[PDB]
Design a protein around this nucleic acid. Structure first.
Length: 193
DNA sequence: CAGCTCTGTACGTGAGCGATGGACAGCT
DNA sequence: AGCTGTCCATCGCTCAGTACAGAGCTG
């Protein structure tokens, strides 16, 4: 990491990119090493987020992590994470951390009230749902969820993690459907006013 | 028995490493 | 021609959640 130790990166955090009146908030699991290094969302050379955002038409050009600060004003997209703490993988986080994260995340969403809270990962929505709605899902599905963030009109939309670690959706192509459906949901909500 | 939870394990792509060797040019 | 060093193509390899079997538990 250009002479920067893994030990130093694990201490770093990644600032949220949140404003009011957003259409979408991308909720990641937590910052990975490269995200902590760069100070930008999804720089992972293999992470599919920026590729899926373009292939779906949520961005009209291929953007990258360096553009994340332009996303609220130009595309109506913000960013946060279920957990603040940096680690190399999603399995380095404890259940307590996730639940402490969900409580902080629900307050952030209740403050900014985006049209749609996007869970970039199934695992984080499984914990979120149980913690915030008291609902333990039997057959948890991707896409639009039946509960709004409490005391808001904010919807919950779930996608497989943009991380390339996930073998069930091996390519950015295998996840674009969900980004397209997200775009469709947004265009519907903007049309409904 | 029949459901639950909780943990352990297995799994596809493609980008980017370091290592290796071939192509090639400079010089004698 | 013979030698030596750089460069670059290419190789093999690592590595960035999810689903599910099955043990242990419990109604």
């Amino acid at each position: 990491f250009n002479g920067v130790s893994e030990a130093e990166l694990l201490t770093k955090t990644l600032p949220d990119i949140l404003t009011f009146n957003l259409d979408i908030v991308i909720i990641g699991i937590n910052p990975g090493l490269m995200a902590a290094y760069k100070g930008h969302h999804y720089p992972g050379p293999g992470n599919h987020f920026w590729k899926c955002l373009f292939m779906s038409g949520l961005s009209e050009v291929q953007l990258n992590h360096m553009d994340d600060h332009t996303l609220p004003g130009k595309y109506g997209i913000g960013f946060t994470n279920m957990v603040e703490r940096t680690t190399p993988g999603s399995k380095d986080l404890s259940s307590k951390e996730f639940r402490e994260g969900g409580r902080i995340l629900v307050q952030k969403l209740q403050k900014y009230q985006p049209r749609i809270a996007v869970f970039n990962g199934k695992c984080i929505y499984e914990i979120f749902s149980k913690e915030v709605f008291g609902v333990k899902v039997k057959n948890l599905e991707f896409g639009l969820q039946p509960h709004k963030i409490p005391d808001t009109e904010t919807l919950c939309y779930v996608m497989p993690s943009s991380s390339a670690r996930c073998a069930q959706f091996p390519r950015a192509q295998d996840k674009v459907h969900y980004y397209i459906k997200l775009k469709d949901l947004r265009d519907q909500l903007k049309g409904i006013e």
